[PDB]
Symmetry: C3
Subunit: 225 residues, 3 copies
């Protein structure tokens, strides 16, 4: 039921992240414009990082227990480490894409940081009632992140090239929905409520990752710079 029934979704997850990394490694070896290089650096780190964090969830070093609700619950603090580094790089990705000010960057990054850090604390709190208090705060940092993301990576992501507002209206819809999913998924699943089995939650989070991870990598890279 825990650290058992889902290794399949976790094993498949490692496979995907890793071939995903292998892919970006043997498809970025060239690169000319220092700029483009930066974008490739980023798109590789994410998969590689998310790669190892998923291998620790598979092997079991990144799965702990947490007393809450009345019994012992499985919490993959390994996930939290994953996003704890991916989300900011990825965020730096989008930012540098529509070239933003170091002010909205430091804002965003650190903001994202209160989001994930706070979320992690939530995920480890032992008294039920509280888990959701943190769920709420982390959310707020994410609704703020996303806010800047939307109203911004639209406007400040328009006054430029021809396709700018186009490709951009894509990336947004996709990042916005994609992201707001983690908040929900978390909530309904094991690490929060108990409306979704850990068995399903993982599969959900995995589709969730692989997409955000590579998916967003590709789409992102495809947006020239």
């Amino acid at each position: 039921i825990t650290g058992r029934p889902e290794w399949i979704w976790l094993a498949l997850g490692t496979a995907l992240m890793g071939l995903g990394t292998l892919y970006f490694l043997v498809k970025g070896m060239g690169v000319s414009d220092p700029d483009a290089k930066k974008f490739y650096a980023i798109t590789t780190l994410v998969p590689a990082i998310a790669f190892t964090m998923y291998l620790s969830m598979l092997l079991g070093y990144g799965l702990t227990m947490v007393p809450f609700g009345g019994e012992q619950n499985p919490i993959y603090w390994a996930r939290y480490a994953d996003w704890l580094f991916t989300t900011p790089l990825l965020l730096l990705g989008l930012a540098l894409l529509v070239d933003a000010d170091q002010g909205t960057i430091l804002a965003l990054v650190g903001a994202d940081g209160i989001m994930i850090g706070t979320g992690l604390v939530g995920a480890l709190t032992k008294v039920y009632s509280y888990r959701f208090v943190w769920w709420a705060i982390s959310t707020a940092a994410m609704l703020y992140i996303l806010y800047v993301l939307f109203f911004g990576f639209t406007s400040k992501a328009e006054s430029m090239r021809p396709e700018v507002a186009s490709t951009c209206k894509v990336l947004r819809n996709v990042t916005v929905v994609l992201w707001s999913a983690y908040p929900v998924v978390w909530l309904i699943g094991s690490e929060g409520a108990g409306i979704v089995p850990l068995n399903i939650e993982t599969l959900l989070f995995m589709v969730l990752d692989v997409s955000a991870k590579v998916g967003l990598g590709l789409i992102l890279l495809r947006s020239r710079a």
Copy 2:
């Protein structure tokens, strides 16, 4: 006596940090000069960060036990996390204020890092005698920080505008004293000696925070840039 008698000073602390954040959020929404924006980004992160870290001290996730001296002691490792991120942002604040070299910045930041990191280790060591060895080292990193702060955020904080040396002679006296307080307070209180009840120590650290946090935020922001 522990994680009990002081919730009042901790509850009041959360209130203050948070309304403090709410304040900077709904008073920075405008901003023009990318520069000014950076300063607002910073002044908000601090309260927000210090906000959540104080809510974890309130709720109890950020309060642990440490065997030293002969009995079990309460240590809010949550404080250490707080300053572990605030102090460097805040430091980046002052630095960018009198526009310094990336050399004195990386120096300062990392220096501050040996200060807090080392301090944290101190706060968690179990053998009495040692606690103070770390107290000493962390201090040294802080006397070095402050050193650059004083002899610098005076000189290198003078050859510019008219009020420069003025406002600046303010900020200094205030940061210097304010800071050197944490070293002392720590020392006389529970997490170190036993000359001050945890009951009082908290109130002291709280006045201490709220001031450093917002106080320094305002004063800081008020210094144009």
Copy 3:
């Protein structure tokens, strides 16, 4: 046998790092060119950081136990913290030396990060078989680091000054060998296999550190900039 027979190599290690820091502190106090300052900032942080991490290994706060193989093993997670910060600064050192692109930097840094972070996880895994899986991955991140280091801090470290390719052909051979040693040493010693006593491993790692730490500091600094 553990946290006992080697304090000598650890005590000598603290001495060396610290006088090493004292040295860079009272030999960098001047400095003119903001640039040179940055290089001095870096060379000091390393010793100072590595200083405190070695004092925690000496005093015993940075030495833990890990069930693997069949019995309890001593693991100085304190080492891992050490390199966890040194290696990236040091890396930033070499990078800025042959002035590289922010792309190869972010790449390198983060890469180094998967190396050390991953290594650390290895060092703490309880099931024998696995330890070496992580040993393998961390290695891969290091063979990639070093790769860029060699084929790069040669070419991209040539088309410049007269001595460039010279001094540079030095620094390389020295960093390359020096580094690849930590991977091997780790492997044959206590924290991995059992072909080397913890008694010897420490002495090895210490010579290893002091050299990388100061040695590389000097050599590095001596390369003007």
